[PDB]
Amino acid sequence: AAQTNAPWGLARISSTSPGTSTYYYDESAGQGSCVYVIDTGIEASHPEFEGRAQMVKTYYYSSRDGNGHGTHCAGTVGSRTYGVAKKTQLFGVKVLDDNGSGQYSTIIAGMDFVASDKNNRNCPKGVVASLSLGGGYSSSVNSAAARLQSSGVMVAVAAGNNNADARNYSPASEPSVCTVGASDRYDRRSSFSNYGSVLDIFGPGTDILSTWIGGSTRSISGTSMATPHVAGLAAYLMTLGKTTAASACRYIADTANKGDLSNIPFGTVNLLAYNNYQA
Ligand SMILES: [Ca+2]
Ligand SMILES: [Ca+2]
């Protein structure tokens, strides 16, 4: 399949070079996979989700996404126009309030919820979790992310937007999950993107157009935007049977565009998520 005039991030993950406009992907498009978006919620009614999104858990008064961040991330995972895995099933877990903030105890609970809730869903091609959140280092947050990964979920987490070593941030610093840095349309590390040995992969993160609340769209930047690119790619590859939840991050790194990025500090992987699609 080919989506013309796609968001640059989608085109980038289906190209060996930057500057393309078409997103080439296999028509399976993550069908049969499931991606839990652990964030501010998802505006499931957005036409861009085509009924494939639903809220499954909220830790606040409402399951409504009153912020937009979670809806944006979910859109990059699997919205029709802005998603990597355009046929995946999206499950919203609202651990962040409508200001985009959340207590670590609630974020931990949301991870534990997904690890259990997945056993009640039909996700034959596997389960992915996109965690476009994080704060300071927390062994308990890291352990929760490790538990979620160990339970059989492909966990993708944002590296953080501190332009610093992700070792000091969680769940970014959890080794067992897929820690995602951000790049821009010119194959530079996003000026805000965290770095360091714990990063597994980079994804498009600067000026990422996706869904937004109120049935709208907007372009925002962050490692929160690169993470769903990798989560959606994992779902896409798992549907293709090329990898599993336990190995998806290693597979994405193994098959990534290598050495394409600039402004990558020594010791940080120079790997950009790439779907290796061949028509
Ligand atoms: Ca290249
Ligand atoms: Ca890792």
What are the structure tokens assigned to 248, written together? 């998806």
What is the Cα–Cα distance from 244 to 251, expressed in whole angstroms? Answer: 9
Has 72 been annotated as catalytic? no
Is 279 part of any domain?
no
Is 175 part of any domain?
yes
Has 39 been annotated as catalytic? yes
Resolution (A): 1.5
Q: Is residue 197 classed exposed, middle or buried when 0-12, 13-18 and 19+ CB atoms within 10 A define those classes?
A: middle
The residues with which 36 forms a beta bridge, in sequence order, are 91, 129
Determine contact, residues 154/132, Cβ cutoff 8 Å.
Answer: no
What is the Cα–Cα distance from 214 to 265, expressed in whole angstroms? Answer: 39
Determine the angle formed by the axes of helices 104-117 and 139-150, rounding to 10 degrees.
10
Tell whether 260 is in a known binding site. yes
Determine the angle formed by the axes of helices 69-78 and 223-239, rounding to 10 degrees.
30
Q: How many Å lie between the centroid of ligand 2 and the Cα of residue 222?
A: 19
Determine contact, residues 171/131, Cβ cutoff 8 Å.
Answer: yes
**Chain centre distance of CA 198:** 16
Is 277 part of any domain?
no
Is 278 part of any domain?
no
Q: Where does 66-103 have alpha helices with state H?
A: 69-78
Is 160 part of any domain?
yes
Its domain, for residue 155, covers 2-272
Q: How many Å lie between the centroid of ligand 1 and the Cα of residue 261?
A: 9
H helix count then E strand count, the chain: 6, 15
What are the structure tokens assigned to 133, written together? 């959140």
Is 19 part of any domain?
yes
From residue 124, how far is each of 31, 46, 74, 118, 131 by CA, in Å? Answer: 9, 25, 20, 11, 21
CATH code, domain carrying 32: 3.40.50.200
Determine contact, residues 42/74, Cβ cutoff 8 Å.
Answer: yes
The number of folded domains in the chain is 1
Is 96 part of any domain?
yes
Is 111 part of any domain?
yes
Has 170 been annotated as catalytic? no
